[PDB]
Each structure stands twice: as C-alpha cells, then as structure tokens.
Scaffold this active site. Sequence first.
Site, mmCIF file in Angstrom:
data_model
loop_
_atom_site.group_PDB
_atom_site.id
_atom_site.type_symbol
_atom_site.label_atom_id
_atom_site.label_comp_id
_atom_site.label_asym_id
_atom_site.label_seq_id
_atom_site.Cartn_x
_atom_site.Cartn_y
_atom_site.Cartn_z
ATOM 1 N N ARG A 144 8.052 82.676 81.527
ATOM 2 C CA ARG A 144 7.886 83.032 82.944
ATOM 3 C C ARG A 144 6.407 83.168 83.288
ATOM 4 O O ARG A 144 5.996 82.845 84.408
ATOM 5 C CB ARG A 144 8.615 84.341 83.288
ATOM 6 C CG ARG A 144 8.794 84.605 84.802
ATOM 7 C CD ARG A 144 9.141 86.065 85.099
ATOM 8 N NE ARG A 144 9.323 86.339 86.536
ATOM 9 C CZ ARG A 144 8.343 86.594 87.414
ATOM 10 N NH1 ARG A 144 7.061 86.613 87.041
ATOM 11 N NH2 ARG A 144 8.644 86.823 88.692
ATOM 12 N N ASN A 145 5.614 83.641 82.327
ATOM 13 C CA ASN A 145 4.187 83.890 82.535
ATOM 14 C C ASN A 145 3.295 82.730 82.085
ATOM 15 O O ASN A 145 2.077 82.873 81.987
ATOM 16 C CB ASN A 145 3.787 85.207 81.850
ATOM 17 C CG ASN A 145 4.458 86.428 82.494
ATOM 18 O OD1 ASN A 145 4.727 86.449 83.704
ATOM 19 N ND2 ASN A 145 4.749 87.434 81.686
ATOM 20 N N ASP A 174 3.330 90.844 77.344
ATOM 21 C CA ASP A 174 4.524 90.270 77.976
ATOM 22 C C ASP A 174 4.463 88.737 77.922
ATOM 23 O O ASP A 174 4.509 88.054 78.935
ATOM 24 C CB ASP A 174 4.630 90.766 79.426
ATOM 25 C CG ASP A 174 5.977 90.451 80.072
ATOM 26 O OD1 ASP A 174 5.997 90.237 81.300
ATOM 27 O OD2 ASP A 174 7.020 90.412 79.378
ATOM 28 N N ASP A 229 -1.002 86.829 83.507
ATOM 29 C CA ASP A 229 -0.307 88.112 83.470
ATOM 30 C C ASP A 229 -0.176 88.662 84.886
ATOM 31 O O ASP A 229 0.882 88.539 85.509
ATOM 32 C CB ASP A 229 -1.037 89.116 82.566
ATOM 33 C CG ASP A 229 -0.141 90.289 82.140
ATOM 34 O OD1 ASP A 229 -0.600 91.145 81.357
ATOM 35 O OD2 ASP A 229 1.027 90.360 82.581
#
Length: 299
Positions: free
Chosen positions: A170-171, A166, A184
Amino acid sequence: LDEHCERLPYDASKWEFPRDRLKLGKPLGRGAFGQVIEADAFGIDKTATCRTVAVKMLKEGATHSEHRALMSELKILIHIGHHLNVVNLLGACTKPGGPLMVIVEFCKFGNLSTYLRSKRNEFVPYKEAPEDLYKDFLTLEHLICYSFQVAKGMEFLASRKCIHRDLAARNILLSEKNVVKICDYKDPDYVRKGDARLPLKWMAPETIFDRVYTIQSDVWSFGVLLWEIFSLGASPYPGVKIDEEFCRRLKEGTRMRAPDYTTPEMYQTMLDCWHGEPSQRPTFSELVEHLGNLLQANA
Ligand SMILES: c1ccc2c3c([nH]c2c1)-c1[nH]ncc1CCC3
C-alpha cells in the site's frame, strides 16, 4: 520528533518554491490528519517545464500540533535526502502569504497493491511466443524488479538510520518506466472491499509482543511485502483470524504458504526475512545483492 525537529534548520534557498508557480488540482489522498493534492508546478527542477507534483498540506480545521507534525515531516525529508526508490522531496512553501505545503514526487499509477491486483489477467511468467503480443503484461522480471527496487530504497533508508515501521505494498508507489518508490478513515458509505488492510499482518513477532520497531523488524515486513508482490496484491494470511493465538503461532514458527506466482527462491527469501531471531534475518544490503542476482539470473 517534536522539539528535536524545531532545532533543525530550513535552508530556503535550496527548498523554498513560490506559491504563485503552484496550481492545485484534485485530491489524491485524504486522512484524519491531512491531504495530498495533485498539482502543476512550473520550474520545480530549474528547467522551463510544467511538471505534475504531489502536495502534502493540512486539512481545513487542522491544529497547531498538525502544523508541527507536517513541519517535522519536511525536516525529516530534508534529512533523509534523495534516492530513486523513495518518494523524494522537491520543495516546500513555508513563508507568510499562504498555507504550508510540502511538495513531493507524483507517482501516477498509485500504490503497488492495487496496481498488481489489477493485472492478474495480464500476467505471464516469461513473454512464450513473439514478445510483441504480450505488450503491457506483467512478468516475473517485473515482480522481481519491484522487489529489488524496494530493497534498494530500504537499504538507503537504513543508511540514514531511518525506520519505516509500516512497510507494505500500500505504501509503495509506482511511477513511469516501472520505477517504484517507498512512502510513509473514509465514510463507510463509499468503502468497498480492498480499501483497507490490517497492519498487524505486517508486524514482526517482536513488534507484536514487545512493541519495538527496528530495521530488522522492517526486514520481516519486507518479507510480507514480497508475498503481496508474488500473490499479485492479495492480503496476507487469507481468511486467518488475527487474534492472540495467531500471534502465539507466529512466534512458535508458523508461516504463510507460497503465493500463486512465486519462484522457489523468492519464497525462500520470504522465509529468511521471517526468521524468528531479528539478527539472523538478512540485512537490506544482503537482500539487495541477492535480489539483484535473482533479477539477473531471470535473464
Ligand atoms: C493515483 C492514486 C493515488 C496516488 C497517490 C499518489 N499518486 C497517486 C496516483 C502520490 N504520488 N506521490 C505521492 C502520492 C501520495 C498520494 C497517493
């Protein structure tokens, strides 16, 4: 992860931190499975300093499975080990006498997507007249520097045979001196635009259809992450509907256009990251050599 991780040791001498040296403050992030709380820790790096840290812990009402899940996450952080461009483990609280707490690096400026989006009126490609007046402005050097850094983080994660699954802005967390680091459902009363994102928009074609994640599917994700950076934190595929035909068109060869702030070689890098064939995508090592050169040529 379970069962396997229970058969990994925990060296308390090197990781265990006393709970009476941890003072908890306000939450930084919630989830359906747990919370990250901001905290002050004395002596977490052996020097006589109080340092601000981030504490992962279980919510109230958390089960046995969620305790196992946090303890697996702790052992994976021990396994992965230290790099400048990942959110690093600093210590844990595991013994009897308090809650389970996994202590990691605090990144004060928060995630890269919200940060970049908040700088669209403080951006210049290169700093023109007296460079003092464009203090605090973002520039091409910053954006390519954030890029190179994440590619370093992922090269490291790859070398520990890890897969992110992912990889998105955002991460990515931002700490001081422009250092960025890889890591994560809130009630709908307090949701505003931008709060969320659709993770399908970062998924490689082979992961959409065949649902397989590999390090080269992370390279595709890195490509979309590049687009976030050079659009200053826009959502990928603007106003596009993410349905069965979108997924069809992705596999056929349809690709995002250039975002407003990209260089031509940075857009060429997105497209190479978005090769239909995973093995023809560049490796994170190759991305590191290449972005380092772009970073150096930006001069
Ligand atoms: C402002 C808004 C959110 C965060 C978050 C962090 N720092 C912030 C600053 C952070 N630092 N280290 C781990 C985490 C995860 C929680 C999210």
